[PDB]
């Protein structure tokens, strides 16, 4: 016969302390953007993005990550 | 025969402390954007984005993440 | 017969302290951008980005990451 | 005695020809402009301009200038 | 006695010809502009200009200049 | 007695010819501009200019200049 005991344990801690957070600035695309196009031929699919796109400012007062996995397998 | 005891345990903790949060600025796309197009031929599908799109400001007072998985498998 | 005991333990800690966080600046694409195009032939898919795209400012008041995995297998 | 005869003459001509005039662009101040001030003391007059001021576009189909003077003087 | 005779002449011509004029571009201040000031003391007059100012685009289809002066002076 | 005769003559011609004029670009101040100041004392007048000022684009389709003077003087 076979007997299996599986009891792993976690009690872990993650933390931050800050006296103050501030005076934070992000200014993507401050300059002029220009595009000019003539006589182009396209014979297959086209995708275009122009200007100030997808820019992120991300200022979490704290932000932390855990990942865990368990896979007990018989045959 | 086969007998299995599977009782994993987690008590883990996540935190932040901030005395004050403020004076945070995001100003994407401050400059002029311009596009001019002449005599283009397209013979298949087109997508276009122009200007200030999809920009994000994300300022959570705290924001944290856990992922966990268990996959106990017999045959 | 076979008997298996699997009971690892974690009590770990991760931390940060800051007296104050501030006066932080990010300014990508401060200069002028220009593109000019004539008489191009495309016989293939086309993908284009112009300007200030995807810039990230990421200012976590504290930020930490941990990953764990367990794989106990019989045959 | 004294006698004076003063009979100057001008018959001069000024001209332009243009077959067509067009596609003229002026774009002053295409980028973002920013000013920040703290704890300034002024004990006399202040004058200030900020932004896009006094810019000129001047496209006369023709534009020409003549100046003339006559100063006939006795004693 | 004294006699003075003053009878100068001008018959002159000034000209331009152009078959076409165009595709002219001026873009002063395409980039971002920034100013920051702290704790400044002024005890006399102040003048300030910031940004894109006084810029000129001048495209006369023809433009020409004549100046003339006559100064007959007795004693 | 005294007699004075002043009778000069001018017949001049001045010209330009162009088959076509175009594709002219002027782009001053394409890059980012920045100024930072702390704890300055002024006991005297101040004048300041920052950014893209006084830039000229000057494209006369034809452009010509002439100056003349006549000065007849007695004693």
Residue numbers in the entry:
A (entry chain B), B (entry chain D), C (entry chain F), D (entry chain C), E (entry chain A), F (entry chain E): 305 to 379
Authors' description from the paper:
Here we use time-resolved cryogenic electron microscopy to study the in vitro assembly of recombinant truncated tau (amino acid residues 297–391) into paired helical filaments of Alzheimer’s disease or into filaments of chronic traumatic encephalopathy. At later time points, the first intermediate amyloid disappears and we observe many different intermediate amyloid filaments, with structures that depend on the reaction conditions.
The first reaction was carried out in the presence of magnesium chloride for forming PHFs, whereas the second contained sodium chloride for forming CTE filaments. After 720 min, all reactions contained CTE type I filaments. In replicates 2, 3, 4 and 5, CTE type II filaments were also present. The presence of sodium chloride in the CTE reaction affected the conformation of the β-helix turn in all intermediate amyloids that formed after the FIA and the final CTE structures, which showed a more open β-helix turn than in the Alzheimer fold, together with the presence of an extra density inside the β-helix turn. This extra density was previously interpreted as sodium chloride ion pairs.
